[PDB]
Amino acid sequence: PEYLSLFIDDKLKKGVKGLTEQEVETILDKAMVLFRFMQEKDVFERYYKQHLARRLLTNKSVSDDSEKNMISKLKTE
Amino acid sequence: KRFEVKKWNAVALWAWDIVVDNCAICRNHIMDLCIECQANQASATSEECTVAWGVCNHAFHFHCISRWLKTRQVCPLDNREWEFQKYGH
Numbered sequence: 592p593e594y595l596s597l598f599i600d601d602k603l604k605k606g607v608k609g610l611t612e613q614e615v616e617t618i619l620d621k622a623m624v625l626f627r628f629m630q631e632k633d634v635f636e637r638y639y640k641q642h643l644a645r646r647l648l649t650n651k652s653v654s655d656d657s658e659k660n661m662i663s664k665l666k667t668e
Numbered sequence: 669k670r671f672e673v674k675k676w677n678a679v680a681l682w683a684w685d686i687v688v689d690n691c692a693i694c695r696n697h698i699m700d701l702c703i704e705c706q707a708n709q710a711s712a713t714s715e716e717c718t719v720a721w722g723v724c725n726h727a728f729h730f731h732c733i734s735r736w737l738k739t740r741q742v743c744p745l746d747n748r749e750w751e752f753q754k755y756g757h
């Protein structure tokens with residue numbers, strides 16, 4: 592789960608790969624599908640919160656729109 | 669000194685992160701044709717393949733966002749309604 596959190600942080604910090612939205616949506620869907628067949632969600636949530644703290648307490652304007660998609664996917668999953 | 673400047677009325681122009689080196693829709697450049705035009709001539713037959721400027725100070729190829737208007741209707745780098753305030757660089 593820690594490595595999954597690092598991967599999602601790397602994908603969320605900047606969309607330099609896949610500038611458009613379709614491939615970003617597909618890769619996020621694949622990531623959440625992979626997370627679906629995973630246990631130990633507590634460490635995943637802890638590391639996701641740590642990554643949120645790291646990305647919000649640093650230089651801003653990373654995506655400014657993908658946060659809503661992330662929270663919606665977390666709600667639905 | 670003999671002449672000293674007291675007041676200044678400079679006008680500052682600003683542009684957003686349009687990425688002049690990579691079109692935010694096709695990823696070629698802010699000029700030099702697009703993905704669906706490629707070669708300079710490519711049977712041009714008049715028409716145009718210049719740059720399109722919106723009300724949000726974003727710039728893409730006219731062809732790129734003209735086609736992109738069928739996929740969505742809000743400029744991808746923001747959530748604003750895209751206008752056509754200028755044509756060409």
Ligand SMILES: [Zn+2]
Pocket residue numbers: 691692693694695696697702703728729732
């Ligand atoms: Zn383009």
Ligand SMILES: [Zn+2]
Pocket residue numbers: 701702703704705706717729731732
């Ligand atoms: Zn073109």
Ligand SMILES: [Zn+2]
Pocket residue numbers: 722724725726743744745746748
């Ligand atoms: Zn825009």
